[PDB]
Amino acid sequence: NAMYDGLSRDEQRLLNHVREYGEKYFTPASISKWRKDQGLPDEVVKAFVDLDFNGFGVIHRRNHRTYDLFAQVLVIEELSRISGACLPFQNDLLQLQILEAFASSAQTSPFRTEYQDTGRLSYALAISEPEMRTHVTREGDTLVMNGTKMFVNNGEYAPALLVSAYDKTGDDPEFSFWMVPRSAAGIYAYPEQKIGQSMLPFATVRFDNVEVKESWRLKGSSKGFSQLYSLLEYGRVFTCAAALGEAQAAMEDAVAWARGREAQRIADLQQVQMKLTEMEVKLTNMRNLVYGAAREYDRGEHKRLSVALMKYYVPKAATEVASDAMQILGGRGYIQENRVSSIWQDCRGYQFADGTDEVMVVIAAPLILEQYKAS
Amino acid sequence: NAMYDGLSRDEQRLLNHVREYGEKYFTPASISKWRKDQGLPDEVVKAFVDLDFNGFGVIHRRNHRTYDLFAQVLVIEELSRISGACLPFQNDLLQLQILEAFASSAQTSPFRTEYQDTGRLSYALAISEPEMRTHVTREGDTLVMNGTKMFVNNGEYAPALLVSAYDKTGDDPEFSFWMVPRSAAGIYAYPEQKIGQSMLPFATVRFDNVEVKESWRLKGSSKGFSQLYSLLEYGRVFTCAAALGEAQAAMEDAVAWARGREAQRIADLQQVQMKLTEMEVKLTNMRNLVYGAAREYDRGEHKRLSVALMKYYVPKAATEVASDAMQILGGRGYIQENRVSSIWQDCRGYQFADGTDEVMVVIAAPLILEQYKAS
Amino acid sequence: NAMYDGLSRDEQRLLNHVREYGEKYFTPASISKWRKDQGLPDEVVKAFVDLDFNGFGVIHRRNHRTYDLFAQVLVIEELSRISGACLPFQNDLLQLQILEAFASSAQTSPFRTEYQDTGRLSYALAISEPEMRTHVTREGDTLVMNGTKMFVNNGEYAPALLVSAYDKTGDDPEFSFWMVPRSAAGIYAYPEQKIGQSMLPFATVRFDNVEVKESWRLKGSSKGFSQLYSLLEYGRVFTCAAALGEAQAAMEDAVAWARGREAQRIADLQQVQMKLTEMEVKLTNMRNLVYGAAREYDRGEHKRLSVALMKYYVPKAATEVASDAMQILGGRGYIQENRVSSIWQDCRGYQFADGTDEVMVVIAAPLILEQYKAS
Amino acid sequence: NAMYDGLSRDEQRLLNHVREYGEKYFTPASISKWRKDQGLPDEVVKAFVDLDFNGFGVIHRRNHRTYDLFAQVLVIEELSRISGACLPFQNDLLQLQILEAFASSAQTSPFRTEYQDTGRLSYALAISEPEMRTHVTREGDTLVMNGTKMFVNNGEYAPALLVSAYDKTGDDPEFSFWMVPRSAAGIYAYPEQKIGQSMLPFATVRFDNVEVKESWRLKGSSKGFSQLYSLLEYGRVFTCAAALGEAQAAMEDAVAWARGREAQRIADLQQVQMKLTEMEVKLTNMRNLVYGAAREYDRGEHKRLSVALMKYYVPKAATEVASDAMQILGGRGYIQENRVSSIWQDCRGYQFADGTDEVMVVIAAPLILEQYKAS
């Protein structure tokens, strides 16, 4: 049990602020167009970073150490709920966090400032590889980068690429980040159209002998895959909060259809009653896992296993809820116009984002063994 | 068990003929374009009705009484397998059959001839209603039709609409079919874009006081909903054969990826091994249900329950196979380019076509009671 | 997320006290014998009510109004975990609570005192009917009871039966409770041996014209089905806490087998890894639902829907975990000796106790509609 | 589709003969007692081998080469259906077949004769090992056997043990079978009580330096694990036919309860209607897989994959049907008296017998790869 009652006043006010923003901009007509444009207007994105977050650290580190993850989760779940869509916000929050972790204050200052002044980021994160094999090597007097990055959000048009690479230019192979201008010769972007999550266009980006300057390398407090890997767990919480939100939007449509429509009403049908309770059980479980993992961080008691179990369960559960919602709306609602069919497609995509189910099993099983040995 | 071995030589030759046709036309490049055009070229459709069906009654009644349903199923399953797509063929076969049942030979002769000469039908079937309330009534010296038909395949552009209606023009409400020219005033078509099955574009069609002539009414051997309802069961067999075929195509891609790719090979992974066996079990079951229901008809021993159990199981099973195939292909393959993601969308649509799962439960449970009382 | 860290110190000490008691008495050898005797020894039951509950209201109302339900849940989950069995404790707690609700202090005082002095209750609750039709009627100068009660825990040997009945002895049919001595003529008990939950033997009890005295009727603050129905929701929380505990015991055996045994170790098997994570996800969800529903009560913010969703999910989830544990232990462990096979049987029984899944759907769907209208 | 219509007259007559035998002996009262005695009376077992099998090779090789497997399947499915129990017959049929394969005619003649004259076998098959490590070695002038066999049907009391072992007495480790008298010193049997399948009592048998004579070694046409492994696939078909039969018995009780009882009738309940159709779909699939695998053998076109897919699907499906039947019968029927709860327990056991689900995945995945490469 974790619903409105049970949040603090401060947390509830945050929701109020986010809900007033979402309702204002995320109309069905607006969202339909923005899905088509694969992106949000300057005004909408700027209004998001201008939001009154009620003192929570949502786009800044309130406590000067970490963000407030539960707060971030409430923001993402609510915007995903109102919009019924995959929004760019969670991807910005993670990219911001990752940049801060690996680069000096002087290096990140320009980018943070741009984000606060426009609500957009001038760089795109490029980490995943097809199968890590992206290298930087010295030829003579030059540093040259070779590799291929996959699933690069906004890879096609981003002004710059924040690229993870093995640096080999040292005497006798280490983890490294490079902020590479998209204008450097040898960078090729190949847009990948996915069946869902239209507003988060990705690309495959190939680096073919790209000259990189030393000043481009991130010189930060954090180092190594270890640090990156921790940061990507936040990405899983974000993704699950989005899945929960969208799933919740599908459930609202199902319920509204069920009471409204008649076939006496469709909601007095045993089949529909069970589907409804089945869906509310899944939503309850999703929310409990997402909120629990998030509140652990904020206590300073994060466990890897919580995040792994959450990621294993929620996107698949979200997809099943959205699918059940389609079944309740009947033949219409397999129509592209209906947001439930977009939601269903979005949620299916969450089963690939930020590590698959199969990867969560590999991460979780030793932690489970460890947990039962330890008790 | 029902695979190649186990078919007669005649049945196997039929497959050979269909497979040679499919391979010839249904290239990935061709299918991609035809998905985009929402329809097949004249040459391809004409080549289908020109096919050597090895003496089976596929587009004609070989035995002069019925079509050869198992043969039709092999044709539809194979074309769906090769194409990885929802093809128009099964919808033509049913529309042809339904026309013959309800109209005189003189009435159907022009339409059959056009189909044999071009591979296309000049009419579209309009039966489903939103919730039957489509009426024909007399005003004075005129017959006037009012109603709304839903999910009308090619409703938007078809030259004529074969419409099911309550005729009230008799003295003291009966089932009736009307072949209405699309040019009759008061006909409004509203295209419905679905998330899958692009080549089978549907429309909502409203009839607003449309003047219908007496010569348009179908005067046939068959009469009443009873007859129509029987015919629509064939439509369920067709739809399930399509689901099986497409599902089978998804499985082939999964297997080819699994052996080819490596992550040593991806097919030596316990997770993938189980998914594979799980998928082959579902395909085995689907095929057994579809082939069994079809062979029952051809024996003259059709049972309603067979068709209901088949329709309950297969589209959902097909969707799960296609989804498992996506999961095996990984992140790519949630990409629109990959046919597995279209297949997944197609198969989800089969859960609405020709009666839902929930409708099959309502049909099947009394037949089950009857079956266990009877033994 | 709700595990040891996250409980207060007070809650943790309670667990320590309960765990020291459980470990002391509930040995495999002891439990095996007690399963066989279908009951616990006087010493064990007395030690339970003598337990230091760390000031929580577990067998008494600390706050003078209600019990402390979350505390009760921790007690029941832990004893079920250590024992791997269905224990009588939760059934006593509910029977105690129900007695207090419907009877005067003078009426309940003897029974409470006996329970505190011996750890046993001298009465058995008789409410469920086969399908409410148990009546009390006046003949002449007598009051006569007729009806049949089902699933009466310890119905066969309990000294007295607390019976729910329609009283018709008033002038112009109302809810009523009667504390009937088992020695009253016309009471017939029929023991029902179940496949699981051996220590909670039930009976069908028929009342055939039993003379009941007026002094036997419960004269309490609480009245009507409404009040009874609320009390039975506590019974659902108790039952789910037991299911969670037993399921948790099955998981521990699975994990211990997996690491210990080898087939290199059985836990490095992809199949086992996934089963393990799947099980830990279900346990996480169960615990979240049970703890959440319990903490709601203690806040004074109980919602019927929480208890309905919990009861819908947990016993079936518990059965699946226990079954997965059996599959991991292999062929042995379908052996009666192995506690995992008893646990599996116990948990299957929880799907009938305190209202079925199907009854939870009927309860939950209107509350869900209400919840989404209200927001 | 594979039901009564669809069998030949000969096959149908066989069923009639088996059904008349089953109905005659397998009364609920008789079965209840025989479950308690863990075995069938001499009269019942003798009547089985005296059955008129209508010329099929059920306990003999009609064609002089193989048994008639489909016929055997009909016999086992029908007896399991009528009895609602796990019967010894299928275990005898396999043991008979295995003996014939590995031993000379002179060696098997006494055992076949005893079986035909009494309906019982004087030996018990001992093959499975805990983890193959059972050896025969020479000490000086003696041959000595050491090993431990698991899950030995009737291991505790069988007059003789047919034991699989590595023979090392040759100069420079080979597969071998030994018919060992239970009276040989050093044989220890440990009865294992399982939660289901009472009539098929198993034991762990330890061989501690047992002197074996050379005349005890089976000298047969068939040799090696390869041959044994093929024979054990028949055991999987038998086990699945038993699972199907018992599952079918559970379904009949569910249906009879549903129409008979009322809660207007319980069968007009949407929840029950769906459970019913879900169950009949699973039974349809089970029967199709079992009958298909069996008919393949009889055609001489056995594929390993058919048997693997069948074994993967059917016992788990059978358990789900039996469980759904329990849920429909309600609270009673978790009672030991009700045969549905025994059936449920039996079917759960089939998930371990003759190779687990997890073992079928390992067997099936390469055959699937092979199958899709081959086409």
Side-chain angles (χ1 to χ4, degrees), chain C residues 129-131 150-151 192 204 352, chain D residues 257 261-262 325-336 338 340:
Chain C
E129 323 218 358
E131 308 172 339
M150 202 139 297
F151 312 124
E192 306 287 353
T204 301
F352 300 106
Chain D
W257 178 274
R261 316 290 294 186
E262 299 161 359
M326 283 170 59
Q327 199 69 16
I328 289 163
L329 304 185
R332 39 200 176 276
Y334 175 73
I335 307 175
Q336 218 163 33
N338 215 287
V340 172

PDB file of all heavy atoms in Angstrom, chain C residues 129-131 150-151 192 204 352, chain D residues 257 261-262 325-336 338 340:
ATOM      1  N   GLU C 129     -21.780 -21.594   5.914  1.00  0.00           N
ATOM      2  CA  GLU C 129     -22.828 -22.540   5.535  1.00  0.00           C
ATOM      3  C   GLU C 129     -22.660 -22.980   4.084  1.00  0.00           C
ATOM      4  O   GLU C 129     -22.185 -22.205   3.247  1.00  0.00           O
ATOM      5  CB  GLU C 129     -24.217 -21.929   5.725  1.00  0.00           C
ATOM      6  CG  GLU C 129     -24.343 -21.052   6.932  1.00  0.00           C
ATOM      7  CD  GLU C 129     -25.679 -21.203   7.614  1.00  0.00           C
ATOM      8  OE1 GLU C 129     -26.527 -21.974   7.116  1.00  0.00           O
ATOM      9  OE2 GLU C 129     -25.878 -20.555   8.658  1.00  0.00           O
ATOM     10  N   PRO C 130     -23.072 -24.222   3.774  1.00  0.00           N
ATOM     11  CA  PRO C 130     -22.914 -24.801   2.433  1.00  0.00           C
ATOM     12  C   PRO C 130     -23.570 -24.006   1.298  1.00  0.00           C
ATOM     13  O   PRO C 130     -23.026 -23.983   0.194  1.00  0.00           O
ATOM     14  CB  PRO C 130     -23.584 -26.180   2.567  1.00  0.00           C
ATOM     15  CG  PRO C 130     -24.417 -26.103   3.806  1.00  0.00           C
ATOM     16  CD  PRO C 130     -23.689 -25.178   4.711  1.00  0.00           C
ATOM     17  N   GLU C 131     -24.703 -23.367   1.580  1.00  0.00           N
ATOM     18  CA  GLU C 131     -25.554 -22.785   0.544  1.00  0.00           C
ATOM     19  C   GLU C 131     -25.977 -23.852  -0.458  1.00  0.00           C
ATOM     20  O   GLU C 131     -26.171 -23.562  -1.639  1.00  0.00           O
ATOM     21  CB  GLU C 131     -24.846 -21.642  -0.177  1.00  0.00           C
ATOM     22  CG  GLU C 131     -24.285 -20.587   0.744  1.00  0.00           C
ATOM     23  CD  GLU C 131     -23.439 -19.584  -0.004  1.00  0.00           C
ATOM     24  OE1 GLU C 131     -22.968 -19.920  -1.115  1.00  0.00           O
ATOM     25  OE2 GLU C 131     -23.249 -18.462   0.510  1.00  0.00           O
ATOM     26  N   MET C 150     -20.126 -25.287   8.369  1.00  0.00           N
ATOM     27  CA  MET C 150     -19.107 -25.938   7.561  1.00  0.00           C
ATOM     28  C   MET C 150     -17.740 -25.405   7.941  1.00  0.00           C
ATOM     29  O   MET C 150     -17.625 -24.281   8.421  1.00  0.00           O
ATOM     30  CB  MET C 150     -19.396 -25.685   6.086  1.00  0.00           C
ATOM     31  CG  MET C 150     -18.779 -26.671   5.128  1.00  0.00           C
ATOM     32  SD  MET C 150     -20.046 -27.112   3.716  1.00  0.00           S
ATOM     33  CE  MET C 150     -21.413 -27.925   4.847  1.00  0.00           C
ATOM     34  N   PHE C 151     -16.712 -26.215   7.744  1.00  0.00           N
ATOM     35  CA  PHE C 151     -15.332 -25.789   7.985  1.00  0.00           C
ATOM     36  C   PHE C 151     -15.147 -25.227   9.401  1.00  0.00           C
ATOM     37  O   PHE C 151     -14.556 -24.172   9.586  1.00  0.00           O
ATOM     38  CB  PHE C 151     -14.908 -24.750   6.936  1.00  0.00           C
ATOM     39  CG  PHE C 151     -15.226 -25.150   5.510  1.00  0.00           C
ATOM     40  CD1 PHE C 151     -15.997 -24.329   4.694  1.00  0.00           C
ATOM     41  CD2 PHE C 151     -14.742 -26.337   4.980  1.00  0.00           C
ATOM     42  CE1 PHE C 151     -16.290 -24.692   3.373  1.00  0.00           C
ATOM     43  CE2 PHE C 151     -15.029 -26.707   3.654  1.00  0.00           C
ATOM     44  CZ  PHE C 151     -15.803 -25.877   2.854  1.00  0.00           C
ATOM     45  N   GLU C 192     -13.653 -33.529   8.779  1.00  0.00           N
ATOM     46  CA  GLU C 192     -13.269 -33.507   7.369  1.00  0.00           C
ATOM     47  C   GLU C 192     -11.751 -33.514   7.237  1.00  0.00           C
ATOM     48  O   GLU C 192     -11.097 -32.524   7.547  1.00  0.00           O
ATOM     49  CB  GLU C 192     -13.841 -32.272   6.668  1.00  0.00           C
ATOM     50  CG  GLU C 192     -15.345 -32.073   6.805  1.00  0.00           C
ATOM     51  CD  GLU C 192     -16.170 -33.059   5.970  1.00  0.00           C
ATOM     52  OE1 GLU C 192     -15.581 -33.824   5.171  1.00  0.00           O
ATOM     53  OE2 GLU C 192     -17.416 -33.062   6.119  1.00  0.00           O
ATOM     54  N   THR C 204     -17.710 -30.461   9.744  1.00  0.00           N
ATOM     55  CA  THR C 204     -19.071 -30.024   9.478  1.00  0.00           C
ATOM     56  C   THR C 204     -19.882 -30.314  10.732  1.00  0.00           C
ATOM     57  O   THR C 204     -19.804 -31.411  11.291  1.00  0.00           O
ATOM     58  CB  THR C 204     -19.691 -30.746   8.260  1.00  0.00           C
ATOM     59  OG1 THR C 204     -18.903 -30.501   7.090  1.00  0.00           O
ATOM     60  CG2 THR C 204     -21.106 -30.267   8.012  1.00  0.00           C
ATOM     61  N   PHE C 352      -8.704 -21.187  -0.629  1.00  0.00           N
ATOM     62  CA  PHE C 352     -10.113 -21.363  -0.202  1.00  0.00           C
ATOM     63  C   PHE C 352     -10.465 -20.664   1.099  1.00  0.00           C
ATOM     64  O   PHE C 352     -11.621 -20.321   1.337  1.00  0.00           O
ATOM     65  CB  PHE C 352     -10.468 -22.835  -0.005  1.00  0.00           C
ATOM     66  CG  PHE C 352     -10.302 -23.652  -1.221  1.00  0.00           C
ATOM     67  CD1 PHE C 352      -9.240 -24.522  -1.341  1.00  0.00           C
ATOM     68  CD2 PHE C 352     -11.210 -23.562  -2.250  1.00  0.00           C
ATOM     69  CE1 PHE C 352      -9.090 -25.286  -2.466  1.00  0.00           C
ATOM     70  CE2 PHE C 352     -11.061 -24.330  -3.377  1.00  0.00           C
ATOM     71  CZ  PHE C 352      -9.995 -25.192  -3.482  1.00  0.00           C
TER      72      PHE C 352
ATOM     73  N   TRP D 257     -20.174 -31.155 -11.121  1.00  0.00           N
ATOM     74  CA  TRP D 257     -20.443 -30.241 -10.023  1.00  0.00           C
ATOM     75  C   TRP D 257     -21.092 -28.972 -10.552  1.00  0.00           C
ATOM     76  O   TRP D 257     -22.074 -28.492 -10.009  1.00  0.00           O
ATOM     77  CB  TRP D 257     -19.155 -29.891  -9.282  1.00  0.00           C
ATOM     78  CG  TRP D 257     -19.355 -28.917  -8.159  1.00  0.00           C
ATOM     79  CD1 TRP D 257     -19.377 -27.552  -8.248  1.00  0.00           C
ATOM     80  CD2 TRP D 257     -19.551 -29.233  -6.776  1.00  0.00           C
ATOM     81  NE1 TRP D 257     -19.580 -27.000  -7.004  1.00  0.00           N
ATOM     82  CE2 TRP D 257     -19.691 -28.010  -6.084  1.00  0.00           C
ATOM     83  CE3 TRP D 257     -19.636 -30.435  -6.054  1.00  0.00           C
ATOM     84  CZ2 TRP D 257     -19.916 -27.952  -4.703  1.00  0.00           C
ATOM     85  CZ3 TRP D 257     -19.855 -30.375  -4.684  1.00  0.00           C
ATOM     86  CH2 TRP D 257     -19.995 -29.143  -4.024  1.00  0.00           C
ATOM     87  N   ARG D 261     -24.645 -28.469  -9.165  1.00  0.00           N
ATOM     88  CA  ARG D 261     -24.731 -27.524  -8.063  1.00  0.00           C
ATOM     89  C   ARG D 261     -25.070 -26.111  -8.533  1.00  0.00           C
ATOM     90  O   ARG D 261     -25.031 -25.802  -9.727  1.00  0.00           O
ATOM     91  CB  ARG D 261     -23.426 -27.535  -7.264  1.00  0.00           C
ATOM     92  CG  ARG D 261     -22.879 -28.945  -6.997  1.00  0.00           C
ATOM     93  CD  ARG D 261     -23.713 -29.738  -6.019  1.00  0.00           C
ATOM     94  NE  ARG D 261     -23.687 -29.160  -4.678  1.00  0.00           N
ATOM     95  CZ  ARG D 261     -24.240 -29.727  -3.605  1.00  0.00           C
ATOM     96  NH1 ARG D 261     -24.857 -30.900  -3.710  1.00  0.00           N
ATOM     97  NH2 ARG D 261     -24.170 -29.124  -2.421  1.00  0.00           N
ATOM     98  N   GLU D 262     -25.421 -25.270  -7.565  1.00  0.00           N
ATOM     99  CA  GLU D 262     -26.003 -23.952  -7.814  1.00  0.00           C
ATOM    100  C   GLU D 262     -25.443 -22.944  -6.804  1.00  0.00           C
ATOM    101  O   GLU D 262     -25.435 -23.205  -5.600  1.00  0.00           O
ATOM    102  CB  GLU D 262     -27.547 -24.006  -7.724  1.00  0.00           C
ATOM    103  CG  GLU D 262     -28.257 -24.946  -8.731  1.00  0.00           C
ATOM    104  CD  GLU D 262     -29.680 -25.321  -8.305  1.00  0.00           C
ATOM    105  OE1 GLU D 262     -30.113 -24.873  -7.225  1.00  0.00           O
ATOM    106  OE2 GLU D 262     -30.363 -26.067  -9.048  1.00  0.00           O
ATOM    107  N   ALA D 325     -10.102 -27.655 -11.429  1.00  0.00           N
ATOM    108  CA  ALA D 325     -11.215 -28.486 -10.978  1.00  0.00           C
ATOM    109  C   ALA D 325     -11.421 -28.351  -9.473  1.00  0.00           C
ATOM    110  O   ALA D 325     -12.555 -28.200  -9.026  1.00  0.00           O
ATOM    111  CB  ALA D 325     -10.994 -29.935 -11.344  1.00  0.00           C
ATOM    112  N   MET D 326     -10.346 -28.401  -8.686  1.00  0.00           N
ATOM    113  CA  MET D 326     -10.492 -28.182  -7.246  1.00  0.00           C
ATOM    114  C   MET D 326     -11.139 -26.843  -6.968  1.00  0.00           C
ATOM    115  O   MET D 326     -12.017 -26.751  -6.120  1.00  0.00           O
ATOM    116  CB  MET D 326      -9.159 -28.224  -6.517  1.00  0.00           C
ATOM    117  CG  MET D 326      -8.589 -29.596  -6.299  1.00  0.00           C
ATOM    118  SD  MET D 326      -6.764 -29.447  -5.637  1.00  0.00           S
ATOM    119  CE  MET D 326      -7.235 -28.417  -4.043  1.00  0.00           C
ATOM    120  N   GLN D 327     -10.709 -25.805  -7.682  1.00  0.00           N
ATOM    121  CA  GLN D 327     -11.203 -24.466  -7.389  1.00  0.00           C
ATOM    122  C   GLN D 327     -12.704 -24.387  -7.652  1.00  0.00           C
ATOM    123  O   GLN D 327     -13.435 -23.760  -6.892  1.00  0.00           O
ATOM    124  CB  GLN D 327     -10.453 -23.406  -8.205  1.00  0.00           C
ATOM    125  CG  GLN D 327     -10.597 -21.999  -7.624  1.00  0.00           C
ATOM    126  CD  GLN D 327      -9.869 -21.850  -6.291  1.00  0.00           C
ATOM    127  OE1 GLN D 327      -9.032 -22.686  -5.942  1.00  0.00           O
ATOM    128  NE2 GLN D 327     -10.179 -20.781  -5.544  1.00  0.00           N
ATOM    129  N   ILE D 328     -13.158 -25.058  -8.706  1.00  0.00           N
ATOM    130  CA  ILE D 328     -14.568 -25.118  -9.018  1.00  0.00           C
ATOM    131  C   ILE D 328     -15.374 -25.888  -7.970  1.00  0.00           C
ATOM    132  O   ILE D 328     -16.482 -25.474  -7.639  1.00  0.00           O
ATOM    133  CB  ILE D 328     -14.810 -25.737 -10.412  1.00  0.00           C
ATOM    134  CG1 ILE D 328     -14.354 -24.772 -11.508  1.00  0.00           C
ATOM    135  CG2 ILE D 328     -16.262 -26.000 -10.632  1.00  0.00           C
ATOM    136  CD1 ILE D 328     -14.177 -25.443 -12.852  1.00  0.00           C
ATOM    137  N   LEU D 329     -14.839 -26.983  -7.434  1.00  0.00           N
ATOM    138  CA  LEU D 329     -15.576 -27.750  -6.415  1.00  0.00           C
ATOM    139  C   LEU D 329     -15.613 -27.025  -5.073  1.00  0.00           C
ATOM    140  O   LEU D 329     -16.390 -27.384  -4.199  1.00  0.00           O
ATOM    141  CB  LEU D 329     -14.981 -29.136  -6.205  1.00  0.00           C
ATOM    142  CG  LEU D 329     -14.808 -30.103  -7.372  1.00  0.00           C
ATOM    143  CD1 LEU D 329     -14.314 -31.420  -6.853  1.00  0.00           C
ATOM    144  CD2 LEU D 329     -16.071 -30.333  -8.086  1.00  0.00           C
ATOM    145  N   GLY D 330     -14.768 -26.011  -4.916  1.00  0.00           N
ATOM    146  CA  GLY D 330     -14.796 -25.147  -3.749  1.00  0.00           C
ATOM    147  C   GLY D 330     -14.062 -25.770  -2.578  1.00  0.00           C
ATOM    148  O   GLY D 330     -13.218 -26.641  -2.771  1.00  0.00           O
ATOM    149  N   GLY D 331     -14.410 -25.336  -1.367  1.00  0.00           N
ATOM    150  CA  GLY D 331     -13.749 -25.768  -0.144  1.00  0.00           C
ATOM    151  C   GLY D 331     -13.655 -27.268   0.038  1.00  0.00           C
ATOM    152  O   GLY D 331     -12.572 -27.790   0.298  1.00  0.00           O
ATOM    153  N   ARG D 332     -14.785 -27.960  -0.077  1.00  0.00           N
ATOM    154  CA  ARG D 332     -14.755 -29.417  -0.125  1.00  0.00           C
ATOM    155  C   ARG D 332     -14.065 -29.811  -1.412  1.00  0.00           C
ATOM    156  O   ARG D 332     -14.207 -29.129  -2.418  1.00  0.00           O
ATOM    157  CB  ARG D 332     -16.157 -30.011  -0.044  1.00  0.00           C
ATOM    158  CG  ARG D 332     -17.215 -29.261  -0.815  1.00  0.00           C
ATOM    159  CD  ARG D 332     -18.583 -29.636  -0.285  1.00  0.00           C
ATOM    160  NE  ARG D 332     -19.656 -28.873  -0.917  1.00  0.00           N
ATOM    161  CZ  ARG D 332     -20.047 -27.661  -0.532  1.00  0.00           C
ATOM    162  NH1 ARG D 332     -19.447 -27.059   0.484  1.00  0.00           N
ATOM    163  NH2 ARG D 332     -21.037 -27.045  -1.166  1.00  0.00           N
ATOM    164  N   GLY D 333     -13.292 -30.881  -1.407  1.00  0.00           N
ATOM    165  CA  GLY D 333     -12.450 -31.095  -2.571  1.00  0.00           C
ATOM    166  C   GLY D 333     -11.046 -30.514  -2.410  1.00  0.00           C
ATOM    167  O   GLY D 333     -10.202 -30.613  -3.315  1.00  0.00           O
ATOM    168  N   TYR D 334     -10.810 -29.879  -1.261  1.00  0.00           N
ATOM    169  CA  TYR D 334      -9.467 -29.790  -0.690  1.00  0.00           C
ATOM    170  C   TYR D 334      -9.437 -30.846   0.428  1.00  0.00           C
ATOM    171  O   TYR D 334      -8.505 -30.930   1.240  1.00  0.00           O
ATOM    172  CB  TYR D 334      -9.175 -28.376  -0.180  1.00  0.00           C
ATOM    173  CG  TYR D 334      -7.853 -28.193   0.541  1.00  0.00           C
ATOM    174  CD1 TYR D 334      -6.634 -28.192  -0.150  1.00  0.00           C
ATOM    175  CD2 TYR D 334      -7.829 -27.990   1.926  1.00  0.00           C
ATOM    176  CE1 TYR D 334      -5.424 -28.003   0.530  1.00  0.00           C
ATOM    177  CE2 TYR D 334      -6.633 -27.809   2.620  1.00  0.00           C
ATOM    178  CZ  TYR D 334      -5.436 -27.813   1.929  1.00  0.00           C
ATOM    179  OH  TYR D 334      -4.272 -27.619   2.655  1.00  0.00           O
ATOM    180  N   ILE D 335     -10.497 -31.651   0.441  1.00  0.00           N
ATOM    181  CA  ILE D 335     -10.671 -32.740   1.389  1.00  0.00           C
ATOM    182  C   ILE D 335     -10.076 -34.010   0.776  1.00  0.00           C
ATOM    183  O   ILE D 335     -10.204 -34.246  -0.422  1.00  0.00           O
ATOM    184  CB  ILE D 335     -12.169 -32.928   1.746  1.00  0.00           C
ATOM    185  CG1 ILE D 335     -12.763 -31.600   2.218  1.00  0.00           C
ATOM    186  CG2 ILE D 335     -12.367 -33.981   2.813  1.00  0.00           C
ATOM    187  CD1 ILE D 335     -14.243 -31.665   2.468  1.00  0.00           C
ATOM    188  N   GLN D 336      -9.408 -34.808   1.600  1.00  0.00           N
ATOM    189  CA  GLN D 336      -8.680 -35.985   1.133  1.00  0.00           C
ATOM    190  C   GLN D 336      -9.603 -36.994   0.455  1.00  0.00           C
ATOM    191  O   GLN D 336      -9.185 -37.733  -0.440  1.00  0.00           O
ATOM    192  CB  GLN D 336      -7.946 -36.641   2.303  1.00  0.00           C
ATOM    193  CG  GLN D 336      -6.584 -37.191   1.943  1.00  0.00           C
ATOM    194  CD  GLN D 336      -5.722 -37.442   3.164  1.00  0.00           C
ATOM    195  OE1 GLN D 336      -6.227 -37.793   4.230  1.00  0.00           O
ATOM    196  NE2 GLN D 336      -4.414 -37.257   3.015  1.00  0.00           N
ATOM    197  N   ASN D 338     -12.144 -36.398  -1.553  1.00  0.00           N
ATOM    198  CA  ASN D 338     -12.349 -36.043  -2.957  1.00  0.00           C
ATOM    199  C   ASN D 338     -11.218 -36.464  -3.895  1.00  0.00           C
ATOM    200  O   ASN D 338     -10.044 -36.181  -3.644  1.00  0.00           O
ATOM    201  CB  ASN D 338     -12.548 -34.548  -3.093  1.00  0.00           C
ATOM    202  CG  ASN D 338     -13.519 -34.217  -4.169  1.00  0.00           C
ATOM    203  OD1 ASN D 338     -13.202 -34.335  -5.358  1.00  0.00           O
ATOM    204  ND2 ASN D 338     -14.738 -33.832  -3.771  1.00  0.00           N
ATOM    205  N   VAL D 340     -10.438 -35.423  -6.778  1.00  0.00           N
ATOM    206  CA  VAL D 340      -9.783 -34.324  -7.493  1.00  0.00           C
ATOM    207  C   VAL D 340      -8.480 -33.873  -6.797  1.00  0.00           C
ATOM    208  O   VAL D 340      -7.485 -33.573  -7.453  1.00  0.00           O
ATOM    209  CB  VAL D 340     -10.741 -33.118  -7.686  1.00  0.00           C
ATOM    210  CG1 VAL D 340      -9.995 -31.961  -8.226  1.00  0.00           C
ATOM    211  CG2 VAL D 340     -11.793 -33.455  -8.710  1.00  0.00           C
TER     212      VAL D 340
END
